[PDB]
Design a protein around this ligand. Structure first.
Ligand SMILES: [Fe+3]
Ligand SMILES: [Fe+3]
Ligand SMILES: [Fe+3]
Ligand SMILES: [Fe+3]
Ligand code: NI
Ligand code: NI
Ligand code: NI
Ligand code: NI
Ligand code: NI
Ligand code: NI
Ligand code: NI
Ligand code: NI
Ligand code: NI
Ligand code: NI
Ligand code: NI
Ligand code: NI
Lengths: 170, 170, 170, 170
């Protein structure tokens, strides 16, 4: 085994490799939304910018798990990144609702990864998940929730409300 | 009695202690509104900021009466601070209307406190009430009144008007 | 339930609402001490400043729990804030001893809240309590303990020692 | 009568002339204390500085009444300024207690002057007394009261406590 490995269970190592793929997949979803909102027949530059940034952050999240894997002496195994579930995301509200659902799915996976680390008595992994992932996930979910509510207030259908709310994200 | 006390009537001293509790209560009401408007299903950051600031100012108002009590040689007696009348404040318009009603109730109490000081021939207390409280109360009531009118103009129901007016308070 | 809520147990939500009331109560205790020490017949400006700052920090602590409640999708319920246990706090030493006892009571409640979060497998809540509350509570208790010892050294009775120690807190 | 005089009663004009003499007398008392505390066998430079400043402020107070008299069209009449009641003021505590008694005597006279202005329906004079004199008098009395308490705490007799408290006034 690796000269650095210590108190790092095979199951944690494998679960990290799957979370890497999930972070890369979410980055890919957000990239698809981002350029969907730059179509000439959608033209929502605030939504585009918001999802482009979310795409970058998710790819950074994947890289932090890749650095982590190497740090503990695990070995990174990357799988194919699935095509996004959709090619068209509808209105801003529907994209946000899809992002909300995706963020809570990522959160579920992260909490299961914390349970695996806790079960294998890995406080260093539980610390990483709490400090770097669980905290950021809850803030993201709250922020997307706020945005959904604000957009429902402003007028969620393809109208003046969507146009004005889009300016808030620019 | 206190080495500093002079021309300070027992009734003024007791009325100050009650106004302290009322200022602390109003600060508590505004704190409740402030974080109500940060709920993920309300998401009105301008209203939240406005009431958070009003909460701070009211607690400062209480402290100025506490400094005053000590300055005149009275003795501060603090009572329990009642729970806010509501836990949910509805729309921005309903919160402003509730704030308007509360501000005029505080004003009434302050004018009664001025009558007590005037009846006991305490020009130093009448000066404090006129310079530090009555002036600020009338400006607050006018400002809340303007805001109610502006919100009724923009569209007081949970719609684009409320969303846009909220930006004016950020 | 809230669109953001996930892995947030009813018991944690209710325990947060009680800790909010406790933080607000401690803020109220410290406010009472602060202006007690500004009485013309006490005149300990260092103690006054120390407890005024502690009053502000506790009210900030309550607000961080209120932000937290909203972040997780819980609903804030504020109760009445009890009158402070005392209206007069005696000497500086007796106020510090009362603060020490209060700080350890708050700490106990926070450790019970950590046990509730741990029992319901909420690592996000355990992280908040460890990073934002437990750490600050232990430092506060150590600092108050140091101060009690320093004051007992300088001379805890209403004398030159209390007067000099008070300068250290200004 | 003066081309400027309007709503200025003979009694208010005469009462101002007496308050001028009283302010000048208090300035003279404080000047005596100030240089008493610079005697080689007293040597309390903090007390000296405190009373020298109080002497200057009282003489400024007299001048503000003299400017006021002229402003309203009254005519200034200055009487002899009595010798201070004492030539030696004892300890710092006894000087502060004498200042406290003098400040409350000045306050009494000012409140009687407010009653005279109120009885003659002179809101301009009541405003001057509230804004320029009553406010400053209550703050002075509170500050002297604090100082007496601090000195009694530090040790009011000619000892280390008096020596240390004196440094606080430098
Ligand atoms: Fe992520
Ligand atoms: Fe107020
Ligand atoms: Fe706290
Ligand atoms: Fe004066
Ligand atoms: Ni995110
Ligand atoms: Ni639609
Ligand atoms: Ni619709
Ligand atoms: Ni106000
Ligand atoms: Ni409505
Ligand atoms: Ni309508
Ligand atoms: Ni603390
Ligand atoms: Ni004692
Ligand atoms: Ni002893
Ligand atoms: Ni003065
Ligand atoms: Ni003596
Ligand atoms: Ni003695």
């Amino acid at each position: 085994a690796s000269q650095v490995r210590q108190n790092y269970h095979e199951d944690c190592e494998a679960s990290i490799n799957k979370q890497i793929n999930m972070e890369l997949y979410a980055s890919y979803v957000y990239l698809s939304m981002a350029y969907y909102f730059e179509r000439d027949d959608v033209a929502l530059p605030g939504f585009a910018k918001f999802f482009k940034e979310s795409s970058d952050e998710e790819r950074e999240h994947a890289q932090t798990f890749m650095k982590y894997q190497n740090k503990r002496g695990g070995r990174i195994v990357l799988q194919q990144i699935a095509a996004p579930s959709m090619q068209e995301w509808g209105t801003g509200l529907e994209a946000l609702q899809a992002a909300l659902d995706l963020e809570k799915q990522v959160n579920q996976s992260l909490l299961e990864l914390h349970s695996t680390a806790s079960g294998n008595n890995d406080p260093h992994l539980t610390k990483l998940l709490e400090d770097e992932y669980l905290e950021e996930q809850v803030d993201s979910i709250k922020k997307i929730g706020d945005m959904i509510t604000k957009l429902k207030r402003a007028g969620p259908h393809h109208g003046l409300g969507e146009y004005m709310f889009d300016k808030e994200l620019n």
